[PDB]
Coordinates of C-alpha atoms and ligand atoms in Angstrom, one line a residue:
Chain A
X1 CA -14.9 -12.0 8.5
X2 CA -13.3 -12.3 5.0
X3 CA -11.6 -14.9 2.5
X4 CA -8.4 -13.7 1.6
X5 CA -5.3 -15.5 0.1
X6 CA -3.3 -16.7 2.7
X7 CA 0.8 -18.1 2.3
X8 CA 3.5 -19.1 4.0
X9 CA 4.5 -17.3 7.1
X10 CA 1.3 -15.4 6.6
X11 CA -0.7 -18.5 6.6
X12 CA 0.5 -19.8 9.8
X13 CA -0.1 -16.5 11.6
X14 CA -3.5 -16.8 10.9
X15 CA -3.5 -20.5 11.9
X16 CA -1.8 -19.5 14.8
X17 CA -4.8 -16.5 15.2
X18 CA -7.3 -18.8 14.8
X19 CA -6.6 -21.8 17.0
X20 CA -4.1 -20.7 19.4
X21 CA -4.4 -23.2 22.4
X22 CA -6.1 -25.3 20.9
X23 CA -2.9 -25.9 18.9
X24 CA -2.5 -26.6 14.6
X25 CA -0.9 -29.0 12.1
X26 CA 0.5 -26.8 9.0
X27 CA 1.0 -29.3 6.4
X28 CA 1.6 -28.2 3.1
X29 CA 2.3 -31.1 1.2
X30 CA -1.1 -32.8 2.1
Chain B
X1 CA -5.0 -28.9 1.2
X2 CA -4.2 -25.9 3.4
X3 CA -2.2 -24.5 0.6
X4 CA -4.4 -24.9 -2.0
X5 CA -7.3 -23.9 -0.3
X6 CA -6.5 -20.6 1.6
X7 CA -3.2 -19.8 -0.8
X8 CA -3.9 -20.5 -4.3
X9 CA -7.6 -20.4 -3.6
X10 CA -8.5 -18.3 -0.8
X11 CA -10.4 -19.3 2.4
X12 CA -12.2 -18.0 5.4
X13 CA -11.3 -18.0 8.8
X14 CA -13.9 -20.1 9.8
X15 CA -11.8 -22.7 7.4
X16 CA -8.7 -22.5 8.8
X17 CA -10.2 -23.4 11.7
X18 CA -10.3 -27.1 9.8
X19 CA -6.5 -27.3 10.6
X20 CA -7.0 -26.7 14.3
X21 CA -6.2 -30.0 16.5
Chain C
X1 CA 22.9 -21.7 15.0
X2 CA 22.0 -19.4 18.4
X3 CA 19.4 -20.4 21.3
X4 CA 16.3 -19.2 21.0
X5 CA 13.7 -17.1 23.4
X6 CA 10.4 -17.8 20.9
X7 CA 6.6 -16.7 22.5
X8 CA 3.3 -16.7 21.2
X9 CA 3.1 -16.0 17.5
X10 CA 7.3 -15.5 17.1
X11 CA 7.2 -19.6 17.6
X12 CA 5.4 -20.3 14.9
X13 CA 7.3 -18.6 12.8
X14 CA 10.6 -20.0 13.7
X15 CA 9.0 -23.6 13.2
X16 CA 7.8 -22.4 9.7
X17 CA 11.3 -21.4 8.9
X18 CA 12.8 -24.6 10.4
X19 CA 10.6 -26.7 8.3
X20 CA 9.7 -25.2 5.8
X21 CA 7.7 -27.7 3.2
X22 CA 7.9 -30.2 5.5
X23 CA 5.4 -28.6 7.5
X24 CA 5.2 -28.9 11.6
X25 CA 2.5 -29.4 14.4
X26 CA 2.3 -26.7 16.5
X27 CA 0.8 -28.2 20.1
X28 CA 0.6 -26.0 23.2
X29 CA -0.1 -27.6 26.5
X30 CA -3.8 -27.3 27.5
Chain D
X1 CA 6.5 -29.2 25.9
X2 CA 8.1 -27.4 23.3
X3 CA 5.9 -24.3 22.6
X4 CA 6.7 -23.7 26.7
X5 CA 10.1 -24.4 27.0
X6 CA 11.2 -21.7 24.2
X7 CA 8.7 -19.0 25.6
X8 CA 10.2 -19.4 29.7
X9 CA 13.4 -20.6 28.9
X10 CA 15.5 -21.2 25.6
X11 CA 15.5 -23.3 22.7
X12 CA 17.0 -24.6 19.9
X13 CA 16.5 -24.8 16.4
X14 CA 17.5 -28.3 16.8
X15 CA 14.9 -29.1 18.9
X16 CA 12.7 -27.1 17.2
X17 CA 13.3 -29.4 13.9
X18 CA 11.6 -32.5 15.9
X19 CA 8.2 -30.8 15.3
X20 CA 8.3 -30.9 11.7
X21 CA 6.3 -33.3 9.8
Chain E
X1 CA 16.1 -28.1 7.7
X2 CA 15.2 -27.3 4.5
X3 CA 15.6 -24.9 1.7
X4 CA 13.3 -22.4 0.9
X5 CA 12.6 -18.7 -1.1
X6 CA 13.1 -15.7 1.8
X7 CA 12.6 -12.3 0.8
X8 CA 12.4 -8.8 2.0
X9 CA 11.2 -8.8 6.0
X10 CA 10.8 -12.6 5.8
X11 CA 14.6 -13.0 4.6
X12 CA 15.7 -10.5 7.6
X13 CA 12.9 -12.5 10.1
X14 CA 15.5 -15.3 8.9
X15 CA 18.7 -13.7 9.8
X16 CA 17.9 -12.9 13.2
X17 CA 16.5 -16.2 13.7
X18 CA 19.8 -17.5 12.9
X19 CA 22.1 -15.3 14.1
X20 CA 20.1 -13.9 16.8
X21 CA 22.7 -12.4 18.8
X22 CA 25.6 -12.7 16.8
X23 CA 24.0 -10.0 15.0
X24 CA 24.4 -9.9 10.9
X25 CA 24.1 -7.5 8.3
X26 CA 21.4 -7.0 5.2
X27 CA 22.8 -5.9 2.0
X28 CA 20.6 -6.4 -0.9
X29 CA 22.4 -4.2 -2.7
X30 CA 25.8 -6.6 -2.9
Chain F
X1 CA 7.0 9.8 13.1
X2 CA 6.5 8.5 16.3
X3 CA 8.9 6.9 19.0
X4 CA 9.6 3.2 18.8
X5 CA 9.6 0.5 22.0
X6 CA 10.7 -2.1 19.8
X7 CA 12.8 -6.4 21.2
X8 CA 13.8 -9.0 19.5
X9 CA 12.2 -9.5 16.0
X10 CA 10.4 -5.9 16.0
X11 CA 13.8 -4.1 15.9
X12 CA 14.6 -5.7 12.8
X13 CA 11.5 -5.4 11.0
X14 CA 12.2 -1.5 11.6
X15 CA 15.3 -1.8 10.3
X16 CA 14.1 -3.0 7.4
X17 CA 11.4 -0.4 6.8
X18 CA 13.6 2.0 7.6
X19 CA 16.7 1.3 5.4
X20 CA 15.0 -0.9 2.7
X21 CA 17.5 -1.5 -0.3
X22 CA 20.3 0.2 1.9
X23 CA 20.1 -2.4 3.6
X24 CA 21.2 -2.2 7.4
X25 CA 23.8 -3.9 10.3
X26 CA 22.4 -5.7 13.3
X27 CA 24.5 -5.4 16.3
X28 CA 23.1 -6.7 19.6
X29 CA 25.7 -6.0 23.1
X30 CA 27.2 -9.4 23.8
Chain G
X1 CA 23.3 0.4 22.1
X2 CA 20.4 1.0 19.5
X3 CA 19.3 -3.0 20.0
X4 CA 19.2 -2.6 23.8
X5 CA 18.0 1.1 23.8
X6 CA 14.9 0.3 22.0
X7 CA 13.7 -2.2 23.9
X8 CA 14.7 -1.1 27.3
X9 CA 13.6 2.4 26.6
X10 CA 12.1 3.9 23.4
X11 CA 14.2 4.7 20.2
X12 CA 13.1 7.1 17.1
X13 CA 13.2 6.2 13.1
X14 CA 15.7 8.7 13.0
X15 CA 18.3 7.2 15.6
X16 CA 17.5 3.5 13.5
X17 CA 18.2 5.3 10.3
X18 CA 21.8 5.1 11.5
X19 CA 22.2 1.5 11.2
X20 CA 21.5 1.8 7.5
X21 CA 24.0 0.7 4.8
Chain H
X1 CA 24.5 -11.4 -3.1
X2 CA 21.7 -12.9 -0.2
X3 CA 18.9 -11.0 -2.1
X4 CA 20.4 -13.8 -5.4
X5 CA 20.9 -16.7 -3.4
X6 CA 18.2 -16.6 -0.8
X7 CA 15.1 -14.6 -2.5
X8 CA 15.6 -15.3 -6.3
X9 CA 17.1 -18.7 -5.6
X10 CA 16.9 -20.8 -2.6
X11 CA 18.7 -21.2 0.5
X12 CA 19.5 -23.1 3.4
X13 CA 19.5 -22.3 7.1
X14 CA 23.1 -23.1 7.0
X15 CA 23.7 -20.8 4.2
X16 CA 22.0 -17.8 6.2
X17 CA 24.9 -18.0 8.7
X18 CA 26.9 -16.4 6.3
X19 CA 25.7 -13.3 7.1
X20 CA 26.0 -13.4 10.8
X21 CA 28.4 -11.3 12.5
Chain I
X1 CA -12.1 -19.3 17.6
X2 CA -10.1 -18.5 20.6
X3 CA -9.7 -15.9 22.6
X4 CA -6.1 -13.4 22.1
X5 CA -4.0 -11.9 23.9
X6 CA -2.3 -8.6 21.6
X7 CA 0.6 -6.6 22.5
X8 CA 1.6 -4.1 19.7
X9 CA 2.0 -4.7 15.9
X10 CA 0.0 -8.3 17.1
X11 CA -3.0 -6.9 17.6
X12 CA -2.5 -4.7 13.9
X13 CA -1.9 -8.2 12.2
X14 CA -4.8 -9.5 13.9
X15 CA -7.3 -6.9 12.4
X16 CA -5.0 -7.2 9.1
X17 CA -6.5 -10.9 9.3
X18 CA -10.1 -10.3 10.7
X19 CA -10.5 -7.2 8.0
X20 CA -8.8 -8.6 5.3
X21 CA -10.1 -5.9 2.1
X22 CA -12.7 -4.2 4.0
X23 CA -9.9 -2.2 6.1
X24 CA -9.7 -1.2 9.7
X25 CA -8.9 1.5 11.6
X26 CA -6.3 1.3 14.6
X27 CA -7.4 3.7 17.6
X28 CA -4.8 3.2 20.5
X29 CA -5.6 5.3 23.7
X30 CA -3.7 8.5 24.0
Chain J
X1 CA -10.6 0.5 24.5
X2 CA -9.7 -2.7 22.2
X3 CA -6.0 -1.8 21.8
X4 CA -5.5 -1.9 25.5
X5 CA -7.8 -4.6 26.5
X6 CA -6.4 -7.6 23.9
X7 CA -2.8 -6.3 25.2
X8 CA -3.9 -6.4 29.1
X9 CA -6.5 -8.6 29.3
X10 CA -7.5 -10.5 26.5
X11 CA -10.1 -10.0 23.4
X12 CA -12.0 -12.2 20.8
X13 CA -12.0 -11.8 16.8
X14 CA -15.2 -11.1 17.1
X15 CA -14.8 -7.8 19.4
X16 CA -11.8 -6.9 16.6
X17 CA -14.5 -7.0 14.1
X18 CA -15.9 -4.2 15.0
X19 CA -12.7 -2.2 14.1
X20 CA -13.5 -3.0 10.3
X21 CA -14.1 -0.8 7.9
Chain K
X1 CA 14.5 6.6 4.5
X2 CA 13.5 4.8 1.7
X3 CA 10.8 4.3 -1.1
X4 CA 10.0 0.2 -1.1
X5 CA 6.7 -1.7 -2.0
X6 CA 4.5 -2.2 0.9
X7 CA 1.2 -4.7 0.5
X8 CA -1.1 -6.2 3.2
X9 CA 0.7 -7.1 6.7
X10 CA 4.0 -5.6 5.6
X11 CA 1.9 -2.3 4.6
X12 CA -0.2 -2.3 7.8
X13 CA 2.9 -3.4 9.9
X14 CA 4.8 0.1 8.5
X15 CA 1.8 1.8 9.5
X16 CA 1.8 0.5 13.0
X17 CA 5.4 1.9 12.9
X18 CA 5.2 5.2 11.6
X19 CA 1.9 6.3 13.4
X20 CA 1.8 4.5 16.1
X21 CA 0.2 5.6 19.7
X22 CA -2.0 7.8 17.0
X23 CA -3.6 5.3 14.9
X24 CA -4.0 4.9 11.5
X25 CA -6.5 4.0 8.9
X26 CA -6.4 0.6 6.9
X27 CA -8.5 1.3 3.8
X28 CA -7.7 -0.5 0.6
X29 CA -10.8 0.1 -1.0
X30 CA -10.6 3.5 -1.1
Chain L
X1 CA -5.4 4.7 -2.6
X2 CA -2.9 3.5 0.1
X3 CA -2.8 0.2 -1.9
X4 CA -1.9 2.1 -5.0
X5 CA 0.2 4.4 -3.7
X6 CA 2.5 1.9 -1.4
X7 CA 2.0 -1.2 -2.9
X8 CA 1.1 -1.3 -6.8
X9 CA 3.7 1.9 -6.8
X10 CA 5.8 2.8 -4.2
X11 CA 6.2 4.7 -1.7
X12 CA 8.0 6.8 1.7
X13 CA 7.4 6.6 5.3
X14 CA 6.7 10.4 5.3
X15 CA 4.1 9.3 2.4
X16 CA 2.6 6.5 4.8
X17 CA 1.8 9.3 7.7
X18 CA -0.6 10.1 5.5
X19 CA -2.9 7.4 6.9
X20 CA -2.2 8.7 10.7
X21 CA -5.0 9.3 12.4
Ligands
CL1 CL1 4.9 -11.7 0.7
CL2 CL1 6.3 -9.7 20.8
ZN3 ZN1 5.1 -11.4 3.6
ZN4 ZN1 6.2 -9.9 19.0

């Protein structure tokens, strides 16, 4: 795969991409 | 965290999968 | 605001807008 | 739950906001 | 909810997620 | 170009592209 | 219309290029 | 315009209904 | 990671994501 | 191929990989 | 149309549009 | 490349069919 820079709604469609069912916490003041 | 990580820094897949429940 | 018909990644990105820095859970059954 | 709910039926933003942190 | 910057496709995303079928217009230019 | 099957969010993200700093109207029946 | 054609049926750039301002 | 208010500034969800239809 | 299921400009973002700067090509049947 | 299988059935990031350039 | 910046998703996502059921080629090192 | 021509400059859907297979 590869390390990209990742924000915003961008970041959460990979979150999404990546964890699907499984489910994700996007938490950007932590 | 997240933000710093994957959109300041950048970040892998394999770590975003750190923010999976 | 209207109602919303939201799937797969199209959720996520509603919740992003809707909360912004905040941040949300996103948590799918099974 | 939530993630359903707006996929088979409808949903609001409203209830949309009670997933945010 | 909160307030946030929106831009380009992400600013229209916006628009139809809160207008949705009310439909709205786009006009950077104004 | 090609012909487009484009709902919901997709329709105005080819708006966008399309009309760019034009910008565009959204106008959904009913 | 154009919303409802496109997603029922097909549509082209050129018939979206309409909707421009 | 919304380019000014929502892009180069900041806006609301509430302020975004201004430019419903 | 999970498994996907990628309708249309989904599956694009997908390899957009997977890809990142090493490109990808998009070959749809017919 | 790829397109059609993550769209009707479903298909891994790792099978997408291949796709890279 | 228009001339309008295009970068990563947003560029790949205007490629999905334009070329479609054809494919296209993602290659930003080249 | 693309990335110069769309991005860093600018440029046209007729300029992106470039990239069609
Ligand atoms: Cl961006
Ligand atoms: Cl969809
Ligand atoms: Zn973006
Ligand atoms: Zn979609």
């Amino acid at each position: 795969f590869v390390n990209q820079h990742l924000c915003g709604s961008h970041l959460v469609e990979a979150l999404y991409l990546v964890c699907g069912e499984r489910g994700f916490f996007y938490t950007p003041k932590t | 965290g997240i933000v710093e990580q994957c959109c300041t820094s950048i970040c892998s897949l394999y770590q975003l999968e750190n923010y999976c429940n």
